[PDB]
Design a protein around this ligand. Sequence first.
Ligand SMILES: *Cc1c(COP(=O)(O)O)cnc(C)c1O
Ligand SMILES: *Cc1c(COP(=O)(O)O)cnc(C)c1O
Lengths: 427, 427
Amino acid sequence: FKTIKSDEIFAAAQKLMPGGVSSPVRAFKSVGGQPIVFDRVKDAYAWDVDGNRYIDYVGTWGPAICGHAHPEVIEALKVAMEKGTSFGAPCALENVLAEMVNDAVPSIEMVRFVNSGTEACMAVLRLMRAYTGRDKIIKFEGCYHGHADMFLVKAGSGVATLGLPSSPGVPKKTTANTLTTPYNDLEAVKALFAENPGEIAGVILEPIVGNSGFIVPDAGFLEGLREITLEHDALLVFDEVMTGFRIAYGGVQEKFGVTPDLTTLGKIIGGGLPVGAYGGKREIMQLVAPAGPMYQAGTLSGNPLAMTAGIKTLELLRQPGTYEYLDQITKRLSDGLLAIAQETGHAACGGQVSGMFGFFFTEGPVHNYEDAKKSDLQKFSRFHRGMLEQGIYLAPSQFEAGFTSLAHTEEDIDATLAAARTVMSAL
Amino acid sequence: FKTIKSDEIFAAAQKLMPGGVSSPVRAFKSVGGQPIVFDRVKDAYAWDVDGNRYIDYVGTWGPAICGHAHPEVIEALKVAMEKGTSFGAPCALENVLAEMVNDAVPSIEMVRFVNSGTEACMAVLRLMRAYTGRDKIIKFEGCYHGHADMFLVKAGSGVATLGLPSSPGVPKKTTANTLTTPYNDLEAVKALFAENPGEIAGVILEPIVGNSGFIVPDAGFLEGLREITLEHDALLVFDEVMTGFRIAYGGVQEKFGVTPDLTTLGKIIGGGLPVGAYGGKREIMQLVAPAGPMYQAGTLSGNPLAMTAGIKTLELLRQPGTYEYLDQITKRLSDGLLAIAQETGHAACGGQVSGMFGFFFTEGPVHNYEDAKKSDLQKFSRFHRGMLEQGIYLAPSQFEAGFTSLAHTEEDIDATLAAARTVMSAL
Ligand SMILES: *Cc1c(COP(=O)(O)O)cnc(C)c1O
Ligand SMILES: *Cc1c(COP(=O)(O)O)cnc(C)c1O
């Protein structure tokens, strides 16, 4: 297993960019510190600058649900670019993707495209505050909602990975209009509403968390949140930037039947390109400029290249037996991992819903970030490296969810379980 | 002049998206009438959905400096996408573009790629604060640096155009750390420092304004800002998202010879795709994760498509004669436009620097946002519609700098002048 080229490239990288990467988690800091540099990706695999091929489970952090470099997506894009990549004025494609999104996600009656999930979350917070006229927002420990000021407090992703705390460039004057509660603690939320009456704009959360590892909500949690916010004239916002189009076509809101007032989408909606969106009830979206006073803009928003990738990705997911296939192969891989762990003497817990799974090195059960924190990270680090050497690419962090795509085959799942066996028979 | 198809598509867009647009500036709310729905763009032209062709002076709001659908850029993107559009892991292309940016921009010693200008500006906002340990920030009235909460105070771009007030939805609590002052007023700046000792983190400005029309700094203003920030151990931040790579290869800071501590990049750096960036002194950039404590992540940051686009675009600009051609053809346009205004009996002023220019319907001169606000908005509204019917596309606002490209020819200039004469002869 040679990584000569990855090593020299990442070495040179550190002198040019902060930590040598464009996003923190790619530095491999909580798993050894030696990242491999990619050259190309195809279907369910990835290739090294050294020639090594891996079966990918990161899937570029959500976007590749259809598989890397889908033939029909890049051909649609090769055709689109001969007409220019960015116009700066409206184009017909915005209208089609927009209509597709309205039909797809329940709560969305009107949309606004942006360039990333971060931008969509910045916008949705401002909108929920503007619509209500209140300033307090209730967020949950372990939920990532983009690298924004108001939300860098017990967030997810790298925050809930390398033990990053609150603030990072944001003052106490920003992270003070944001109340925090433990994920799944319906009672703690009620407390915050009774403790700060008439001043909570709303609650925002990942309906299913993937940024503190995979954590599913309990029996009547989401239903609880919908009712309590209602009783107080507060807005319920679902950050489905990761869950959207993966858990189901209409996301977690469709799968579990709880409808929020606004939702945010990103990742899969751009099909592999920088795109995001925020939408919800009509009367609320009416406040967004130019239709309203709340300002939010973006030079590259709605660009045709992005709209093209977006539309092709949704046409492919709308086909017969898409999610059934994801639930099927992902259940086999998840159950298979937990079985191998049990027979090798390793304590573990996990699960999956459609093409999103989780696996933790602790008996659990995991109900929140604190529970997630009791995992043996030293074992995870060794597990991750071993899997890497066996040709399987896993998220370099215990606090990230795993992903599956329509290009993963039954055989691909069988080889992964085979590697997991050879590996867990060490540690 | 027919715009039936544009009218059909827009009327539909309004039922799907707020104001039927993805960005507030695309709305013809102030320039009268409805927007023109584009179909394709190439070189110096754009074609709407009804067949009308136009000589483009908006250049997708900045990115199209080499011209729309540049053949050398799109073929490079075709080859690239074959390898996958996003990796979610390091790629060698990030090193190449990073190395090009350090070389290009004087103050940049270390860079971090982000997906937009709004993102670069939000990140730098946080860094100024993390590095200095101070909370307050000085920004100028009429300038624009994205829609991050703290910047939504006396902003330019679409807020100006639509006559929108500061904010809605951004807590008073956060808005209070933003100190504002009129552009070109060195004394108001010194007053703000002397009144908030040890509290100002720094000053952020568009070195050459393009968001409240085209405004150049008065002699000594930038050198003065450099002086007074060094003296109170505060940061000098240049928002070069629009000026970068346009005013000169190294932007205004290279052109006018004043070196800041941190600068933000966007538009042209993406080459038509969504890309942004921020960088500056190494010791300041070291605070960014995973090297320092300040957390800033991005799923699509550094993706291979965007890197390829930027790499190719910067290679075209690096060629000899680039900025000289841009200056030459923009000078004729600016001068010509001014000559026609005088000759047809209209009060007007403006100017140009390389590929950026402005034209106001006021005697002038313009030194700040208030000055710019005196332009005859009704005359511009009629002049815009007139130019539109003659086949010339200008930004639908008096508060937007106009742009030029390497694809515009002497003939396109002459045809625009011929059109300006015809339109201005009525009014
Ligand atoms: C990844 C993520 C984001 C951030 O979007 P980017 O594209 O990285 O800006 C926001 N919310 C959730 C739930 C995420 O998974
Ligand atoms: C356009 C602009 C921005 C905002 O950048 P986007 O890419 O629209 O998100 C920031 N700074 C300046 C000066 C701008 O011209």
